[PDB]
Design a protein around this ligand. Structure first.
Ligand code: 5GP
Ligand code: 5GP
Lengths: 201, 201
């Protein structure tokens, strides 16, 4: 029993979520895999405000192994990119929250990068808090079920640090960019109510 | 006079292009900006062959300035990623070819990386030509107008090295992930015959 998602749906999800996200006032977006990149890119179009330069999106690939083992398959070369996580608001993007495992470590590893950058600059997060980095999360879908790992309480709780376009029942979702027959995929999606929901203007 | 492109169209363009591209037998994809990432990601779904691991996609941002000036805003950290361009077939992806300027330098800079990564490896493409790197290009659209830059002739000639989904006229194309009203954008696209061109199965 699959749930078919149309491109246009993913687009409207980002759209509505764009507003709530506008608070967190992100300084940059870090996208997990290609899965998180597509919505991240769309998400950007909506966060564009006249004059203000367009927010940057950094893609990262993260591999998790067992017998937990983390592996930075593709990471941000802060060096050559000249990216400073210090005192910035980072928004982590990925399509769906299943067991939360992925975001758990994604946040984790990125936090290490922040705190270690802070040292390198000679700063003390303790003595001078404001210098700390504020992390945010954004997912199209957040499955409601038993999560096999977890994200820090204060964030997971604040409705302006963790955004789930939609929270949905434990099922398997097929995303437009995965299908080898978009036409079928689409027809299905429309038949399950997974197409638009915000009529034209 | 804009040309509205639907997500589903971009999807089918990749689909058909997937075949011709299957020859070049790409070892990895390097995507220019988010623009090239979305189609690159889709393109992947179609290149998947049972058993064989899924091809990797590397995103890069390239800034070009004048008064030409190149700036690696975001590049591939071959180091930590453990990526070897030597003797591999790289496919460069980006949504549209306008003045070719972008791809000109994108290819250029990436070629430097291959060369320098080839020499410092203790090899020479002259005596051992089975090691040089073969570059490929893929764009949804390739506008026909007089270009401002240029790619090597042997590549822009061999129809198994330069892939352009649909070769379009000189106009301005609005891509789905750019629109702030997908519904309108879509209706328009369908009315210009810029939606699907292949049916279900
Ligand atoms: N297409 C699709 N991928 C899923 C689904 N649930 C999980 N995934 C994939 O599995 C990864 C694991 O997420 P986690 O379980 O660690 O929170 C996701 O990022 C995503 O790539 C689903 O319903 N549909
Ligand atoms: N949306 C859109 N972007 C375009 C169009 N033509 C060029 N661009 C943008 O301009 C860049 C310049 O490409 P170049 O002119 O250097 O070959 C493209 O990669 C793309 O981001 C168009 O018709 N529509």
């Amino acid at each position: 029993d699959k749930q078919y998602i149309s491109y246009n749906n993913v687009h409207q999800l980002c759209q509505v979520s764009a507003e709530r996200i506008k608070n967190f006032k992100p300084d940059l977006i870090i996208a997990i895999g290609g899965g998180g990149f597509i919505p991240a890119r769309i998400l950007r179009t909506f966060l564009k405000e006249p004059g203000v330069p367009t927010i940057r999106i950094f893609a990262i690939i993260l591999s998790l192994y067992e017998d937990v083992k983390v592996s930075r398959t593709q990471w941000i070369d802060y060096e050559q990119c000249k990216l400073d996580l210090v005192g910035k608001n980072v928004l982590i993007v990925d399509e769906v929250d299943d067991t939360r495992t992925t975001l758990h470590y994604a946040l984790s590893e990125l936090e290490k990068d922040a705190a270690e950058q802070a040292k390198a600059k000679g700063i003390d997060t303790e003595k001078s808090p404001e210098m700390k980095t504020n992390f945010g999360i954004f997912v199209l879908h957040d499955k409601q079920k038993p999560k096999k790992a977890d994200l820090p309480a204060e964030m997971l709780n604040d409705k302006n640090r963790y955004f789930a376009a939609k929270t949905v029942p434990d099922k398997w979702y097929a995303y437009p960019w995965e299908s080898t027959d978009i036409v079928f995929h689409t027809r299905m999606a429309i038949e399950q109510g997974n197409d638009i929901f915000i009529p034209e203007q």
